[PDB]
Design a protein around this nucleic acid. Structure first.
Length: 90
DNA sequence: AGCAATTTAAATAGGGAAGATAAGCAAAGGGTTGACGAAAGCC
């Protein structure tokens, strides 16, 4: 259900980012997505308040299914449609 | 009240034994370190 967990994400909060200061201080909430470093093995990250979200009825939330087997590059190129592309880019 | 000599050669070989064992217990703790966001009195 990788379309559902995206409207979920975005509603709860949703900030995909490949760089943050939350790894330094948890009081941070600064999130920037760099466009120019997305590669085939680039593992993207995400944040929602209290890390909220729903699983895919297999035990995995948005983060592990988006990190597994280059699915972020799959959506970012557009191999899973352009209706997931604009949601992921927004 | 200091003087004490020089060279020369220092053993070749053969042996350093294997057989055994090398414990089984039972313990190895949890106590703090939660931010964001939302009710709810309060200037």
């Amino acid at each position: 259900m990788i379309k559902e967990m995206i409207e979920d994400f975005i509603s709860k909060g949703g900030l995909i980012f490949t760089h943050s200061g939350r790894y330094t201080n948890t009081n941070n909430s600064c999130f920037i997505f760099n466009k120019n470093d997305i590669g085939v093995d680039t593992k993207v990250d995400m944040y929602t308040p209290k890390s909220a979200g729903i699983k895919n009825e297999e035990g995995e939330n948005l983060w592990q299914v988006l990190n597994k087997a280059n699915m972020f590059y799959r959506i970012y190129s557009g191999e899973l449609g352009e209706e997931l592309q604009y949601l992921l880019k927004s």
